[PDB]
Amino acid sequence: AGFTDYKVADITLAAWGRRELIIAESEMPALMGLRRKYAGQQPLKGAKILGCIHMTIQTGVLIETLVALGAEVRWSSCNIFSTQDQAAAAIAAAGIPVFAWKGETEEEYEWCIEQTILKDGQPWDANMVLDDGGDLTEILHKKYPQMLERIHGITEETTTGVHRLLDMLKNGTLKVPAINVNDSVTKSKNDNKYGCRHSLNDAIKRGTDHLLSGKQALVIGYGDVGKGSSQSLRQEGMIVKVAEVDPICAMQACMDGFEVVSPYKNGINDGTEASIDAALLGKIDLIVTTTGNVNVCDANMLKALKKRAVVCNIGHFDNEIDTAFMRKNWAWEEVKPQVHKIHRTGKDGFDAHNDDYLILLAEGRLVNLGNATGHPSRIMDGSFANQVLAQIHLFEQKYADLPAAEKAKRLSVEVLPKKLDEEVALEMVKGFGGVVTQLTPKQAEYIGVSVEGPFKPDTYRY
Amino acid sequence: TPAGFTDYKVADITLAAWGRRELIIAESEMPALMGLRRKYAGQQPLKGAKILGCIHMTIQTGVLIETLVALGAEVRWSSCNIFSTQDQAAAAIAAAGIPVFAWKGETEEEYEWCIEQTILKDGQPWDANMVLDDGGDLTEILHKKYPQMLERIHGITEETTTGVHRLLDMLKNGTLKVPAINVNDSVTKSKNDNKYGCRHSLNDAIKRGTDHLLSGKQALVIGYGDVGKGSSQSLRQEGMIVKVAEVDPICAMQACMDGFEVVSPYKNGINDGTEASIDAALLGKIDLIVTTTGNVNVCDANMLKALKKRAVVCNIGHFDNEIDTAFMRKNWAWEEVKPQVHKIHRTGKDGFDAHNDDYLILLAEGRLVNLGNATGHPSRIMDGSFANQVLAQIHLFEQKYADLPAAEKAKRLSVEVLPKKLDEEVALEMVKGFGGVVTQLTPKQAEYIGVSVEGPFKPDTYRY
Amino acid sequence: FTDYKVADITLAAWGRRELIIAESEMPALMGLRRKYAGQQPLKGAKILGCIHMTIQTGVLIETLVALGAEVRWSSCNIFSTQDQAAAAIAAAGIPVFAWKGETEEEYEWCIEQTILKDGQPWDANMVLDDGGDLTEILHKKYPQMLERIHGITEETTTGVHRLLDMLKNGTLKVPAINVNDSVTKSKNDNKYGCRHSLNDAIKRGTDHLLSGKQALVIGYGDVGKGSSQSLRQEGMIVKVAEVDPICAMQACMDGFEVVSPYKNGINDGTEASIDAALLGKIDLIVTTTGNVNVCDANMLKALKKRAVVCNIGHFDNEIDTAFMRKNWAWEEVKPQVHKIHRTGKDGFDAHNDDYLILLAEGRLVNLGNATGHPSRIMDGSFANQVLAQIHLFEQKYADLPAAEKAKRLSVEVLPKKLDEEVALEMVKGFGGVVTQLTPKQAEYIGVSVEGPFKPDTYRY
Amino acid sequence: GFTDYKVADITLAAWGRRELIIAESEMPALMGLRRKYAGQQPLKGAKILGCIHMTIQTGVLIETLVALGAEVRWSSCNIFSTQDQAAAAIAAAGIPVFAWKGETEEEYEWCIEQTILKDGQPWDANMVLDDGGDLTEILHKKYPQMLERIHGITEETTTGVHRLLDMLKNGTLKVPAINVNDSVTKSKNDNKYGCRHSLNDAIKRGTDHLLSGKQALVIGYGDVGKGSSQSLRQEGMIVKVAEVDPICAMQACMDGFEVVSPYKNGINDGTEASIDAALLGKIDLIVTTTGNVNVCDANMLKALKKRAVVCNIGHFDNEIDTAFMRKNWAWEEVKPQVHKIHRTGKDGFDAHNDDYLILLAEGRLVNLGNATGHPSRIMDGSFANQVLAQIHLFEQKYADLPAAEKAKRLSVEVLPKKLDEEVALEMVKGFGGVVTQLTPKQAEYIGVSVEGPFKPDTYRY
Numbered sequence A: 001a002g003f004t005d006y007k008v009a010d011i012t013l014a015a016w017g018r019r020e021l022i023i024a025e026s027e028m029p030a031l032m033g034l035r036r037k038y039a040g041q042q043p044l045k046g047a048k049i050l051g052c053i054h055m056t057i058q059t060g061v062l063i064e065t066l067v068a069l070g071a072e073v074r075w076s077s078c079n080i081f082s083t084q085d086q087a088a089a090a091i092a093a094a095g096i097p098v099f100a101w102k103g104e105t106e107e108e109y110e111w112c113i114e115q116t117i118l119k120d121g122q123p124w125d126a127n128m129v130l131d132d133g134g135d136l137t138e139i140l141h142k143k144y145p146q147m148l149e150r151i152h153g154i155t156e157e158t159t160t161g162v163h164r165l166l167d168m169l170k171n172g173t174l175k176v177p178a179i180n181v182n183d184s185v186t187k188s189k190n191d192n193k194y195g196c197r198h199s200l201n202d203a204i205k206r207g208t209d210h211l212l213s214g215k216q217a218l219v220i221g222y223g224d225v226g227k228g229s230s231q232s233l234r235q236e237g238m239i240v241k242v243a244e245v246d247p248i249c250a251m252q253a254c255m256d257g258f259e260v261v262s263p264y265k266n267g268i269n270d271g272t273e274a275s276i277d278a279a280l281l282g283k284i285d286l287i288v289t290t291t292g293n294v295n296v297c298d299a300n301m302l303k304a305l306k307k308r309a310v311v312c313n314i315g316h317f318d319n320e321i322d323t324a325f326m327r328k329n330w331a332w333e334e335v336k337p338q339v340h341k342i343h344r345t346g347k348d349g350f351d352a353h354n355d356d357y358l359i360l361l362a363e364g365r366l367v368n369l370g371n372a373t374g375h376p377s378r379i380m381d382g383s384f385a386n387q388v389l390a391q392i393h394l395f396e397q398k399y400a401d402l403p404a405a406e407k408a409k410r411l412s413v414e415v416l417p418k419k420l421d422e423e424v425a426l427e428m429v430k431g432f433g434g435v436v437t438q439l440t441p442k443q444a445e446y447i448g449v450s451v452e453g454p455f456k457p458d459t460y461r462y
Numbered sequence B: 001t002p003a004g005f006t007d008y009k010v011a012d013i014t015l016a017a018w019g020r021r022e023l024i025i026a027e028s029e030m031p032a033l034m035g036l037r038r039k040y041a042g043q044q045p046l047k048g049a050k051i052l053g054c055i056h057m058t059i060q061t062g063v064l065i066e067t068l069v070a071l072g073a074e075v076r077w078s079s080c081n082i083f084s085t086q087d088q089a090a091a092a093i094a095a096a097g098i099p100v101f102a103w104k105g106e107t108e109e110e111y112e113w114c115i116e117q118t119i120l121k122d123g124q125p126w127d128a129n130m131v132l133d134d135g136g137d138l139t140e141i142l143h144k145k146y147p148q149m150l151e152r153i154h155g156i157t158e159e160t161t162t163g164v165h166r167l168l169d170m171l172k173n174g175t176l177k178v179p180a181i182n183v184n185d186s187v188t189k190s191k192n193d194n195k196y197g198c199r200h201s202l203n204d205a206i207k208r209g210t211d212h213l214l215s216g217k218q219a220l221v222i223g224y225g226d227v228g229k230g231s232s233q234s235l236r237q238e239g240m241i242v243k244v245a246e247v248d249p250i251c252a253m254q255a256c257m258d259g260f261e262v263v264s265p266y267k268n269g270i271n272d273g274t275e276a277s278i279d280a281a282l283l284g285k286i287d288l289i290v291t292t293t294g295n296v297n298v299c300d301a302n303m304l305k306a307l308k309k310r311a312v313v314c315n316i317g318h319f320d321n322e323i324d325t326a327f328m329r330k331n332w333a334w335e336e337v338k339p340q341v342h343k344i345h346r347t348g349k350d351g352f353d354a355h356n357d358d359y360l361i362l363l364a365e366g367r368l369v370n371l372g373n374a375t376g377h378p379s380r381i382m383d384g385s386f387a388n389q390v391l392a393q394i395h396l397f398e399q400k401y402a403d404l405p406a407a408e409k410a411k412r413l414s415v416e417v418l419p420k421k422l423d424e425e426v427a428l429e430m431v432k433g434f435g436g437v438v439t440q441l442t443p444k445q446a447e448y449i450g451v452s453v454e455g456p457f458k459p460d461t462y463r464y
Numbered sequence C: 001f002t003d004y005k006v007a008d009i010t011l012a013a014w015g016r017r018e019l020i021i022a023e024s025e026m027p028a029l030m031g032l033r034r035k036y037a038g039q040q041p042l043k044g045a046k047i048l049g050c051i052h053m054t055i056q057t058g059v060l061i062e063t064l065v066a067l068g069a070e071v072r073w074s075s076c077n078i079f080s081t082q083d084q085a086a087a088a089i090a091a092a093g094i095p096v097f098a099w100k101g102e103t104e105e106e107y108e109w110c111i112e113q114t115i116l117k118d119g120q121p122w123d124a125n126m127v128l129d130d131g132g133d134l135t136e137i138l139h140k141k142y143p144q145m146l147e148r149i150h151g152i153t154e155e156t157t158t159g160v161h162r163l164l165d166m167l168k169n170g171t172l173k174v175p176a177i178n179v180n181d182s183v184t185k186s187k188n189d190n191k192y193g194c195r196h197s198l199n200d201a202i203k204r205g206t207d208h209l210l211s212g213k214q215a216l217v218i219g220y221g222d223v224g225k226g227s228s229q230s231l232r233q234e235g236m237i238v239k240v241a242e243v244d245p246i247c248a249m250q251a252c253m254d255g256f257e258v259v260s261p262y263k264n265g266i267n268d269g270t271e272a273s274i275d276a277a278l279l280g281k282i283d284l285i286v287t288t289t290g291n292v293n294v295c296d297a298n299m300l301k302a303l304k305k306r307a308v309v310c311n312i313g314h315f316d317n318e319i320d321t322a323f324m325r326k327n328w329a330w331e332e333v334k335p336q337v338h339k340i341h342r343t344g345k346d347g348f349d350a351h352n353d354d355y356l357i358l359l360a361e362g363r364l365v366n367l368g369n370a371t372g373h374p375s376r377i378m379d380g381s382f383a384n385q386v387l388a389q390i391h392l393f394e395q396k397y398a399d400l401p402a403a404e405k406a407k408r409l410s411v412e413v414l415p416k417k418l419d420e421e422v423a424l425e426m427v428k429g430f431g432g433v434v435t436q437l438t439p440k441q442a443e444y445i446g447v448s449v450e451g452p453f454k455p456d457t458y459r460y
Numbered sequence D: 001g002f003t004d005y006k007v008a009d010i011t012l013a014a015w016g017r018r019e020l021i022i023a024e025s026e027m028p029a030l031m032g033l034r035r036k037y038a039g040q041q042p043l044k045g046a047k048i049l050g051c052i053h054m055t056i057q058t059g060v061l062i063e064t065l066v067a068l069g070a071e072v073r074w075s076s077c078n079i080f081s082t083q084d085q086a087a088a089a090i091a092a093a094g095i096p097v098f099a100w101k102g103e104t105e106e107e108y109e110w111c112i113e114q115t116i117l118k119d120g121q122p123w124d125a126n127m128v129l130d131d132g133g134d135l136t137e138i139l140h141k142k143y144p145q146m147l148e149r150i151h152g153i154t155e156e157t158t159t160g161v162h163r164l165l166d167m168l169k170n171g172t173l174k175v176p177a178i179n180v181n182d183s184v185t186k187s188k189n190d191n192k193y194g195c196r197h198s199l200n201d202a203i204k205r206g207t208d209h210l211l212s213g214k215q216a217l218v219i220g221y222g223d224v225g226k227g228s229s230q231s232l233r234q235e236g237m238i239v240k241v242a243e244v245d246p247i248c249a250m251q252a253c254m255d256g257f258e259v260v261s262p263y264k265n266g267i268n269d270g271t272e273a274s275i276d277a278a279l280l281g282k283i284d285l286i287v288t289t290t291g292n293v294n295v296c297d298a299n300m301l302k303a304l305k306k307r308a309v310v311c312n313i314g315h316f317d318n319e320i321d322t323a324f325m326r327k328n329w330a331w332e333e334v335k336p337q338v339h340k341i342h343r344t345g346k347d348g349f350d351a352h353n354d355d356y357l358i359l360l361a362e363g364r365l366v367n368l369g370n371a372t373g374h375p376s377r378i379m380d381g382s383f384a385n386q387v388l389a390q391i392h393l394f395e396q397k398y399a400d401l402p403a404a405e406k407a408k409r410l411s412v413e414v415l416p417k418k419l420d421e422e423v424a425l426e427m428v429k430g431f432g433g434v435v436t437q438l439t440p441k442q443a444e445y446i447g448v449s450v451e452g453p454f455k456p457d458t459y460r461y
């Protein structure tokens, strides 16, 4: 009532979004348990959170949990294609500043982040940052250092964002402490792996409706995302080959029943077309990049791929595939939103019945969020419970209020304690109806733990 | 071969030629280990090493032993389990002139005597300077009974999760006398051996012991660590309906996401010591229970009383006390079907009806079932574990802890893992053994993610 | 051209882009275009067609037209049409009456618009049907039209059942081909199609995580087999119900627990017969039977709160949706997704926790909440359809003397050689290479190098 | 003083009996028939020549036939498939059996002849139970006068049924037969799921090789090839499938396998040049499943990757050209039923030669040769069908019919679907499964009886 501090595609989608938020709450017991547990305490009272993460229904439940615990927020998405417009509308209609829609331009994307940072033309009195991929963190460090003086911490969602934070810490340019939310086991080995297992074949089916059974896939990478991606395709009946630079990850792919191959002859990427295994790439129906690295599906790979193969990326940033090369040299035909045929016959025009094209999904951006709805609520429950606990921890530590000598001792990138990781996990297990056994005192003594946990040393890999 | 060689004890030396044939095949399945042989034989990095070894005397252990010898070591060997030896492996090693005391089906008394035969030579302590152990039993006997021998020993290389736990307790209590390398927690060990090895060998052992169809039947796996993960997959891939018990909610979360129902033998997960706390409806539907925990009494007497008639009971953790077999020895009549397979008749202690329908089938008398009823992990998986073992032996032997002044000894008394670079190099050889091709980063790519082109590729915190 | 009714003709360009992609996914059907285009075997055919107006059906329609036929087309389900496909067909000058979200009355009107042209019965002479509704309307309401029709080609298990009942009763008036029971139809479509498209539809409709949750699949025929796999491969804990013990044996061997919603399997009509403990743990129930009331009112009352309920059999009476309409309040989440509030009939609390989620109002969920089977699977079914249309049209039953008709009035299948030829084109679409027997090897196993490679009794 | 047998070691009998008692608890359909029919003695007067793998599972079948009143004389249908403790237990029960693991081909023939003859003269046989058709062939070729008094043959396996249908076509089949193979509770239980259980079992027992991550080629994708492909894929192998039947190949593709041919463009012209050497050089394991001849031929064997494993799970050992390997290459026995074949030549071998293949069971049925064949709970279905087929043909009394009526009954038939379903129901109850009962309204709706049969005879499952 009088609220205009937002920008979304269509505010009238709010009732639809609210219906889906009410369903999603029933799928997110760890997050909803934190609401119940901390509602009276209001641990985020006085927190003012700049948030930059995919404006989905799941992020909706995260936002309203932070608000229910006392926080004020200003929100944007961390990707131009990942917003669910009904989710953004429901948040805006609740009176929460959100600047996000599906299908932003790069200029609009940056404008949206700037609308969270500034309120009424001046820096908002922010004191906390929640980020997915590091874009908001980078803009604050480069353009708003005075704001960081009053910010107590950053809670960072994803592998790429943490790598950026560690580079800043190494270079002495990180200005506030961070929690690496990614490396909770209830994030990394739930979201990154099982979330992509669910949502990769989901996005491919929505975008192309292609049969996957019996066809040949190449997954570039076998980290947490590459593992879940390979399972997403293999469980559909795809014949999956895996590429890797890490021999330990490659070993896992072999033992998991995949053939390990390289796009390059003997794995040597010397920049020549001669180095491409053309016989291999000419048999591939689907390539998926999962690395967080640059140019792992390069121009010469794209030139050699089988006619009508599907090309997509589920890493955080669109530079895993050389889409710039495709924009410069080949003609793009939109099939429908986030689905383009790339005609390898030339740049100027195309024949509508040309057989020599590739299908690119989400213009090379995160395909699970761009062509579907990303991870399901019950998986995001784990990631976002960690986010709320991380926000509580850094806000209560009050880094910005500490003397300089004390700041120096606390300026770090840390993970949440294992005990909290376990508490998130138990809520997830209860949501499945699972029943965990309680150790007897003698059994706890025998393996050297407290009955209530933690149950594993910090070195344990799960 | 050595003339007059008698410094061994095995079941049947005539199996040696068969053992040797299998060692030659196994060498072709163990490229990381054989690559170490080829790379280091001329350097002789273990020349002067005198290694006491205690680990399952299988064909795979034979390839490890002869790798250490080829690098210059002398060894004296025993098995770390009474049922895990392959007698043809023991025979081939003995026939090669290597002291080995090991056979399938030892008594507990014979088991201890075999370890002591490695420790002693001609009635007196051998001048050992290295220890290679699997489960901690040899480590324990040396500290307990021959503490003076530890004054000349440079290190212990410990293979398995249970043994590392014992070393860490000793370290924290000030009772560990020499430094050790935790071989178990190399990724090419723990996440290869413990998981994939059990995937291969659990269903193998159940089939050899019982020849039961597994598809369509109900299993309960106690534990979902690395062994529990691999065990659950061994059964699920055969078509079993697998339920998983855990005390660790993170491991339980993984089981749910992996497609398993998580359940407890106890109502509400609480064991109050009474029969009434047992979920009798659940246990009365289970055809197979497998313990994987490294913990004590996780398949207890009340659970055994509640199990469905003719269910199979087995343990793939390191020690037999996961299952309360002592209760079953005390109260129920054992009928041997064949070696390492017993029907346990719940009708009473004194005799049994040959056609009684109320029995359980116990495999390997509750000892490690993959080694007891089959041959344990396959060579190509043990390649990773045993390559790490050789590298750990070389590292500790070259460090020469026993020759350091006591000040430097306090600074080095630790339980360490091998560096990730070595872990990666073992993995690369394994991948090449499958014919896999690892891609090489470009310089720009390596800069982009902040690694060297040669690795390591992951920070030490990475969990894979 | 105005002889059509679709949701939005401006979607035609989009539909045409998707048809061009689908053609590249349907090698058996496009091979039939290439090999029969010269002969024009359907020249003079006037085909009434009633099947889901999807992109895949568009490629089928345009194949029939490419071989010489005229058609008039409708969907066989109110929710299965892809509006861009109908638009592209209408824009091509082909009469089609079909949109996503028809009412039952509009559904019947659409079939009647294919039957009538300019207020009079079209001079149709062939029938292509999926489910038997068009076949039924012709026999009951326009029986004189059947005197000019040479044959019916029926797509699905339910429709074949209806054809056989009519043949047994002496009420079938023209010969038919059972397309369903080509192996490249039944053992491709019914099973593998549902494997692809069931989890697809559930994700699109709910975006629920399936891994770790409990499913109950009612039925384990071809659709139940593919459905059970669609869920188990996502990591669901799947239980299977069956009345057929052979199918139940397969479910056990395939690694599923076989259960009944009723104590000891006995459905005696009472709430007391419901296994309430079982149903109270189920997160998802899927019906696959082609039978009536296999997810009944007492089961729906006993289901776990917030369970998803859906049907992938042909007709919406597998679930007792009428009971839910009568007794419980429906809250639309979005098209083809309803929360059914078990708290009562008149109104609901927006935050009530005691609801079920029904997909597609109990209608075919893969077509209702997603896009049905994928092109490369529908390729097998629709190549068989084309071959069956060619066969019956060239036979010209409607022109035979009465004595020759009596010996021709049957429900037949296509010869195994054609089944094998469809399969060969599908295998080449995957890049697979089929080996050729040597003469000695063919002699050894008692077949021709040319095939057929199996007796008609072989079950694959 | 019972001496009418020949087994490896009669002192194994107590061990065999312990395993039979366990197996009975795993075979509820077969033991159900025992309890149902023991009082009626439907096989009283039956005198059955039996030729099928002398396993523990066959022991339960034999003792079911005897419990129902039959007398039998038994041999194995494969030289490597007998479980010697099973044979001993049967012989110690006073049942004539001539079978041991590791027969020569001459011993194999002699064992069949010992069942046919008693005291040097034809036994008064009147029923035949066969697996593969060898006993059937010897009777037609050498003992036609015995067939005049035989009421029928119950044949277990695909290859034997083919041999029966050839005789029927040629007019040389002398007695009617039941095709036991094509019950659904046989073909789509035993042939498929039995090989799923027992193929990777035999490979592990023979080689202890890791299978995960390695490349397999399965020749054939019928019932045995389907189960064999699953046996390997579920272990983590990368499995490729070859087929001559495009419908079976379509199934392999849709089931998630790559379909390949050993021959370039699938053309087997007999030349080395036709071999896809790149493909064969990547294969770690080849398994033949076809019932055909020479599907793993000499040129494939020459092209295979060094140290690949070669085995056959079809009925006969000519699927692999082992004759070529005997003639050209040196064989080194690793242990019983496991040989290294050294491709370096015929005259001896280097013990450390790297260029060898590993052949299992000398190319004979690998699941029975290197392990124990299918498990009891699967053989329960096949062998309940066998008992029911024996009862049916014995009660028909074909040998006693007039010539004109014999001509009308000389056929190869399957059991009716109601029997198939009742066998399946007992199997499902053995898993604890609960089948639902149709209401009258539902039965009318789909047009079946509440008790079944639930499917038309054309249904393929």
Ligand SMILES: NC(=O)c1ccc[n+]([C@@H]2O[C@H](COP(=O)([O-])OP(=O)(O)OC[C@H]3O[C@@H](n4cnc5c(N)ncnc54)[C@H](O)[C@@H]3O)[C@@H](O)[C@H]2O)c1
Binding pocket: A158, A159, A160, A161, A191, A192, A195, A196, A220, A221, A222, A223, A224, A225, A226, A243, A244, A245, A246, A249, A290, A291, A292, A293, A296, A314, A315, A316, A317, A366, A367, A368, A369, A374, A375, B439, B441, B445, B457
């Ligand atoms: N789309 C999603 O929902 C989602 C979810 C989580 C993470 N992510 C993103 O996905 C990316 C990967 O994350 P992760 O957690 O799997 O990281 P990870 O470190 O666990 O895995 C990345 C893998 O890529 C491999 N790799 C790097 N360069 C390669 C090359 N040239 N060829 C082949 N393999 C190569 C590395 O060896 C590594 O194993 C990051 O950008 C992360 O932020 C996306």
Ligand SMILES: NC(=O)c1ccc[n+]([C@@H]2O[C@H](COP(=O)([O-])OP(=O)(O)OC[C@H]3O[C@@H](n4cnc5c(N)ncnc54)[C@H](O)[C@@H]3O)[C@@H](O)[C@H]2O)c1
Binding pocket: A437, A439, A443, A455, B160, B161, B162, B163, B193, B194, B197, B198, B222, B223, B224, B225, B226, B227, B228, B245, B246, B247, B248, B251, B292, B293, B294, B295, B298, B316, B317, B318, B319, B368, B369, B370, B371, B376, B377
């Ligand atoms: N047989 C083999 O070849 C083999 C191979 C490797 C390791 N092991 C042995 O197996 C055991 C387990 O090894 P690991 O590497 O899997 O260890 P791990 O710590 O990774 O897993 C053990 C799991 O057991 C769970 N657990 C403990 N007590 C429990 C209880 N009461 N109920 C249910 N779950 C319980 C723990 O939470 C833990 O996740 C050790 O004894 C190890 O030495 C055996």
Ligand SMILES: NC(=O)c1ccc[n+]([C@@H]2O[C@H](COP(=O)([O-])OP(=O)(O)OC[C@H]3O[C@@H](n4cnc5c(N)ncnc54)[C@H](O)[C@@H]3O)[C@@H](O)[C@H]2O)c1
Binding pocket: C156, C157, C158, C159, C189, C190, C193, C194, C218, C219, C220, C221, C222, C223, C224, C241, C242, C243, C244, C247, C288, C289, C290, C291, C294, C312, C313, C314, C315, C364, C365, C366, C367, C372, C373, D436, D438, D442, D454
């Ligand atoms: N949605 C799709 O894309 C699609 C595709 C093909 C077929 N169908 C339809 O799906 C239905 C099934 O087709 P099908 O080919 O699998 O038929 P089918 O005969 O192969 O299988 C139906 C199964 O349901 C079982 N069944 C019947 N009543 C039952 C009950 N009360 N409880 C449990 N099981 C019961 C039968 O025993 C049988 O095995 C038909 O209506 C068919 O037209 C839908």
Ligand SMILES: NC(=O)c1ccc[n+]([C@@H]2O[C@H](COP(=O)([O-])OP(=O)(O)OC[C@H]3O[C@@H](n4cnc5c(N)ncnc54)[C@H](O)[C@@H]3O)[C@@H](O)[C@H]2O)c1
Binding pocket: C435, C437, C441, C453, D157, D158, D159, D160, D190, D191, D194, D195, D219, D220, D221, D222, D223, D224, D225, D242, D243, D244, D245, D248, D289, D290, D291, D292, D295, D313, D314, D315, D316, D365, D366, D367, D368, D373, D374
């Ligand atoms: N070992 C066992 O326990 C066991 C069990 C059952 C049957 N069998 C035997 O296995 C064999 C196969 O039985 P089945 O029931 O699977 O028969 P089947 O007819 O179902 O399958 C055999 C398949 O082999 C294919 N084939 C034939 N020649 C081929 C070639 N040159 N290349 C590739 N594929 C080729 C055929 O197309 C067919 O699909 C028979 O000999 C049978 O008696 C063995």
Ligand SMILES: Nc1ncnc2[nH]cnc12
Binding pocket: B055, B056, B058, B059, B060, B061, B197, B371, B375, B376, B377, B378, B382
């Ligand atoms: N085969 C094997 N040899 C030695 N140690 C083992 N641990 C597990 N399997 C083993």
Ligand SMILES: Nc1ncnc2[nH]cnc12
Binding pocket: D052, D053, D055, D057, D058, D194, D368, D372, D373, D374, D375, D379
């Ligand atoms: N165990 C077994 N017994 C008899 N015949 C068989 N055929 C396959 N496995 C068998």
Ligand SMILES: [K+]
Binding pocket: A056, A058, A373, A374, A375, A376, A377, C207
């Ligand atoms: K989602």
Ligand SMILES: [K+]
Binding pocket: B058, B060, B375, B376, B377, B378, B379, D208
């Ligand atoms: K082994």
Ligand SMILES: [K+]
Binding pocket: A209, C054, C056, C371, C372, C373, C374, C375
């Ligand atoms: K579709």
Ligand SMILES: [K+]
Binding pocket: B211, D055, D057, D372, D373, D374, D375, D376
């Ligand atoms: K067996």
